[model samples]
Structures are given as structure tokens and as C-alpha cells.
Target: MFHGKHPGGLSERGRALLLEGGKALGLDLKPHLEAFSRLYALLQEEEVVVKHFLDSLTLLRLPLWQGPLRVLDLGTGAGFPGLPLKIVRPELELVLVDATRKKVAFVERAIEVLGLKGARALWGRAEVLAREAGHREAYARAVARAVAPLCVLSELLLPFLEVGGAAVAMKGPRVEEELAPLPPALERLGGRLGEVLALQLPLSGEARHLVVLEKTAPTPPAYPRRPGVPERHPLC
Candidate 1:
């Protein structure tokens, strides 16, 4: 079992929902939990912080996310906000992507076990995925959790988003600092900072931030630069 200081694991109700509700989606919940446990074990020392962050998703307003919402979770290692959000709001269309093959496979299994319909797994880097015609038409909301600096994430996520769509980046307290370094990238990508919603997690004092980016225009073809290049030498 993956143990931590706080009530880090799922509640009995949460587990039951995963097992039963997931089955309705044609998923088998046990393997999904097994994968979660494996990943959680690796991060057990940070369980308190992780749990708080996950729980904060519940605090998001329905207006911000409701009705035929199509979401793309980029670099979803073990499906943090994406999986949890899907569990809570089954109506959202979700596509979880990651560069690592193993992680993508894990997401596939979780989708099957959780019986998640309208959720698919894509295996590739964000830049490559963004440039694809299929992804271009797939999502309304693009999201990332701890993927990269704001500048780089804007490049990776915004290109995949349709005009007027939004990118929700899960961030920490230093949101202003992160946003300050990304103006050029934001402009070139036809995006701008939309809103910063400060979140107070239940049972935790650490401040979290959700930096939302709105796609104002179409992204130029030159974006995303090249895989591994964005982080090595970020834009602006």
C-alpha cells in the first residue's frame, strides 16, 4: 500500500465509484488502482501536497467547466487533474497525452478500468501532438500540470487549442513570476493570460494557482520550435 501522512488515498466512496461506476464504462477498476498505487508509492513523501492539489480541483466552479467540455491533458504522467476531473465530471471529453509510452499505456488501462468513455490516450510529445490535424479539432480546453515553465507550456498547449478555447495550467504560488517571462511567446502563439484563480486547498496552507490562457487568434505554423528545444532555450 502507498502510505502517507494525510488522508492521501481515495475514500471508500471514491473507491466504490471507481470500481462500480468505472465498470459501467467498461473499465476494470483494480488495475487502475494498482497503477495509481505504484505511482503514488514513488511520490509518497509528497503525498500531503499531492492530495491537497488533487482535492483543489473540486473547488473549481461549474461555470468554468460544464457542458460538452472537451479537455486535453498534456504530459499526463499518471493523470492527476485530468483523471480526477473526469471522475467528478463525467461529461467532459478527455484526451490524455504523454511522451512516454509506458505512461500512455497506463492511461489507456486506467481509462478502461474506470470505464471512461470519450477518453483516449495519445502517445507523443506535446509539440508533435499539437501540430496534428486530429488534435487541432479535438479540444476546447487544454490543460497541463507541472509540465513546464509558462512560456513553454503556452507554446505546447495553445497551438492545439481552437480559437477562443482556454488552457488551464496548474501552477504554484509564483504565478506572476512565471507569467512575466512569457509575454512574447503568448503573443506569437495568439494567446494571452486570461485569469489567475488562487486556490486554497482543503486542510492545507500552501497556496496553489491556476493560470488560465485564452487563445485569441490562430497559432502560426512555426510554433512549438522543436521537441527538447523549448525547455533548453525557452521563448522570451
Candidate 2:
């Protein structure tokens, strides 16, 4: 078991999540945790957001995913849920994307340092990548963590997922409230609510939700509008 420092020092719970959980998942996570610490140091050293971590873990444990899956992580800032998920499921082919150059660089470095096989990082916007033909048949699942609203996020990520594939959003307690205002966009983007799963963390009381959206059909190309358009003038 690998126990690495986290920013100042590893919290007991963080240590368990990194070391014990890693061991159970058949991954050596010390190097990955160290890389995370370096990245955390560069950014604000907020305590490792445990709810997001546990939500991601729970999603990985879903029976729908067997060994050797393909996954994409959109807007993977500092590789939160994506990187950790990749570490646990080393058999999955993981591609992480973000618009920020520095964040992408950090993800690439973390991938290299952790020696996470079958995982890579792309420096680009999700919409652009989703439109590219190379990404068309690339993933079985696409994931986003607190990236955008459901409507905007569906447009950004669902385009890249193959039909029948799914996009899992790691969300907070207000997921239903967020979905209430975006019905039209959800329908237009070829997405439907698959499951709304609530999760409790190992040692945290923060309420978390996983809003699973099944990609039933190919998203129309016109979606996602422009970069800031969705944020400025959201659909429905």
C-alpha cells in the first residue's frame, strides 16, 4: 500500500482513500497521489474534495462497466474524477480533455508520473473534440465533474459518445433542481435522465449526486453553439 502526502500532509481519510482503496482496486496510487499533491500545490490547496472522489468511485463500480472499457473525461481540471477513475480501472482506455493549457499539462504530467497505462490528455475544448471524426468511436462512457450545467454539458460531451453509450455527471445535491430548468436542452441534445443516484462518502457528510444520462442518439452538429453562447444564452 502506498501512502503519499497531500499538500500539507495526508488526512487520515485521504490516506485511506488513496492507499487502501488503491490496493483494493489493484492499483498502486502513491505516485498518482503525489502527482495530485503537486498539482494541488500549484492551485489552491483545497482539501481533496472527498464527495467528488467517492462519487467517481461509485460510478466505476457500476455493473454496466466491465473490464477494458473506453472513457472520456471532459473539462478535466487538474484531473479530478477522471484521473482517479483511470488509476482504479487501469484496464479502461481514458482520454482526458480540458481547454486550459496549464491544466492539460498538469494532467499529462500526472499521467506520465503515475504511469497510468492507456490514459492520455488532450488540450482542447470539449465541443471541438466532440466534433472531430477521430473521437467518434472513441469512448464507451464520458464523464464530467462540476463542469457545466446539464444542458450545456450534454451538448459538450454527448456528441463524443457513441450512440447507446452514456455520459455520467458527478454533481452536487441540487442535480434535480438543475435538471428542472433544462428539459428542452436535454431532449434536443439526445439525452435522457438514466439514473439519479445519491451517494454518501466514506467520511464526509456532503450530499452528492450522479446524474447519469444515456446517449440514445447522435447529437446534432448544431449543438453546443459557440464557446460562450451556451453560458450566455442557455437553451430552455
Candidate 3:
């Protein structure tokens, strides 16, 4: 088993592979804890890595996904959930999209170094990408972390999923209160809230919520308006 540096990080083999992966990715990991030391825009690298992989492992076991899967990571800053999931579930066809070109390049490099197959990164705004035939309503699962609020997030992610697909949002605790104002936005975007799962972080035991939204219907062509419009005027 490659356990990073923590007591229950990646397994030994997992650790070894990652070290080589880091080297190949131009990000170095050493002495165990170093694997996730580089950090990202949020959370501790080591802790979040383990939590994300574990959570993804659990998601795969869910009955909803019985076979091969395609996943889209929107606003995937530093490729948190996407990269870790791909590392563990190598068979997953993962596409990571972020507005920042630097983050996209870094994730691409990491994928190459990890020797991971079936994963790629795209650099652009989700607003525009969702209009393209190749991307609109194209994924089984769409994930967004460090993105926007529920309504804005739904607008950005729902368009990328098939009717039965889901959009997973990683939101902090105390956000359920915000759900009260999201129905109109979700409705316009053709989705409805599904599972409101609670994720427990292993190291700190901190609580986070996974807002699972099911795509009930196709998104309107005019939705997601433009790049700054959604942010400036959220649906909710």
C-alpha cells in the first residue's frame, strides 16, 4: 500500500508510485509527509489527498455507477478531487477544466508524470465550454470545488452532464442554509438537488458537504449567459 507520509496516507506502493509520479510531474515528494506538502488553494495537501481519494472510492462503490465512467472537474484548482480520484481509479476517464492556464498546465504535467492514462486538462471558462457539442451534456459526473455558490455552480456544472448525470459540489459546513434560495436557479438550469452527503475528513474530522445534484433535463441554450454574467448576477 502506498500511504503518503501520514499514518494512513497512501500505501507504501502508492507512496512509491507517487514519488516517481511527483518526480515525473516536476513536483517532488520525500520522507512520506512531503507528498502533499506543496499545498493548494485550500486545505492541507496530505489530509485532503487522503480524504478525496477515500471519498471517491466510496462514490464508485455506490450502485448509481455500475460501469465505466466519465467525470468532469470544473474550476478544478490544482486538481484536488479530480487528480486524486484518477490516481486511485485509473480507469476513470477524467477531464479537468479550470480558468487558470497555470493550474491546467500543472495538472497536465502531473497526469503525465503519474503515468496516469485517460485524463486530460482544459483551460477555459466553463461558461463558453458548455456551449460546445463535445462538452455540453457530455459527462456522467461533474465535480466542482472552490467554485461558486449553489446556484451559480449548478449553472456552470449542470450543462456538462447527461440528463441522469450528477454534479458534485464540495462545500463547507453551514451551507445548507443557503439551499433555501437555490430552487429557481436549479430549475432554470434543468437540475434538482439529490443527495446532500456529508463527508468527514480523516485527519481533522472536519465536516464538509457534497451537494449532489441530478440533471433532470437539458440546460437551455442561453443559460450560463457569459463569463462574468453568472457571477455578477447569480441565479438565486
Candidate 4:
């Protein structure tokens, strides 16, 4: 519904908030003001803007070196980390995938409206996609934000990452429980827990923990199980 007849623009206060938040995050919003404004209109709320736009940028905390890397966003509902990362690092090629058709459609439309190149949205389960020839071991980085626990996330994301690539799992502050079972899972998934970054949101000060899992070996062919098996019977 957001083609030419989209909603209104960001309010003065919303713009100020975003500008301040962007500054704190080391991002400049001046050049991408219109795109952000369109996002604000599509999202139609300040909270949504901050969460999807600003919080998503937190993935950069792990230092994704500049290049033409293929990045995958697993279960990218409404395109959080993928879209924001593409907006900032335009050089990166992004593939935002989700099981939900509507969300994928929304992200596809957002990609077109945002004038983002080298980015596309796909609707499919990570399990099936990871088994495919073109998608298997095809991504330099796979990111899952608040999608599942660390153990299960590793199974779903690591299969898509090439050896030496990383899978980033964005989680909450209290990740000890999830972290505890991750080692065994990573071993089976051909990944190793690399970094655990603990930080607060730039503006709201909300606690966030990013767990980076490095792909050390090729994932087994049977991994990711079935469509719903990962969440049902998580590794480790």
C-alpha cells in the first residue's frame, strides 16, 4: 500500500530522535533522509523505526569488513538487520529471507522503494534453502536477530555460511542459558562460537548480546533437520 500514496513524513521529534540515535551509532542520516522518512511512513511508528532501523544497525558492532560480500538475513521479518546494513553499507550484496510471505513481500517492496541494488527478498524456510545447491554454503555472513535460541540458530544459519564465514545471532543481555548449550551444538553444526558482544542500545540503553559463530568446517548434509525440527529438538 506504500507506492506513491504512502502516509505522511516523520515528525520533527522523530527526526530529531533518529538523528541523535544515528549520531550515537556513528551513522549519518542526512543523505538517506528521504529513504528513512519513507521507512517511517511504511512503519508508521517511532518505536518501529528505532527497533528496525537503529537496533538492526547494531549488527555492525562485529566489524563486517568492507567488500562485495554476500550476506544473508534469516527470518528477516520486515527486514531489520539486512535492510539497515544495506542502507549503510551499500557495497554489500544482501539476501533477506523469511518464511512469511507477507513480510518477504514487504521487504521486497522496501528494497525497490529504497532503491537498494544487489538486494533481494526470498520466502522459504532456512532449512530448505540451506540444502539447495545455489544457497548452500553461499553466504559470507548469515544473521538471525531474535529468531531463536543460540543452539537452534546455529543449526539454521551455519549451513548457509561458507567456511570461515560467520553467523551472527542477536539476542538479549542474559544469554548464559543459551550460551551454555551452544558449544556442543556448534560442534555438530560445524561452527564455533567466536564472539559474544554485550552492549546497550545507543539511545534506549536496552541490553543486547550478539553471539557470533564462525564456520570452521562444512555443515553435515542432514543438519537443520526439517522445517520445524530445529526449534522442537534443538541441538545440545
Ranking by TM-score: 4, 2, 1, 3
Residue-level lDDT of model 3, residues 127-177, one tens digit each, is 999999999999999887764788788888999999989888877776765
Off by over 4 Å in 1: 1-59
TM-score of each: 0.78, 0.81, 0.77, 0.94
Better-scoring candidate (TM-score), 1 or 3:
1
In model 2, the clashing pairs are none
Error in Å for residue 97 of model 4: 0.5
Q: After superposition, how far is residue 63 of candidate 3 from its true place, in Å?
A: 5.1
Model 4 TM-score on a 0 to 1 scale: 0.94
Location of the lowest summed lDDT over 10 successive residues in candidate 2: 38-47
120-173, model 1: which lDDT tens digit per residue? 888898867777888863578988887488987888888888898898888876
- Mind giving the per-residue lDDT tens digits that candidate 2 earns over 91-157? 8888998889999999898787666789999998765666678896457898888646877777777
Alpha-carbon lDDT of model 2: 0.71
Q: Residue 146, candidate 2: how far off, in angstroms?
A: 1.7
lDDT of 4 at 134: 91
List lDDT for all candidates, in order: 0.71, 0.71, 0.71, 0.85
**Which stretches of model 3 miss by more than 4 angstroms?**
1-66
Q: Where is model 4 more than 4 Å wrong at Cα?
A: 1-7
Q: Which is the leading candidate under TM-score? A: 4
Worst 10 residues of 4 by lDDT: 1-10
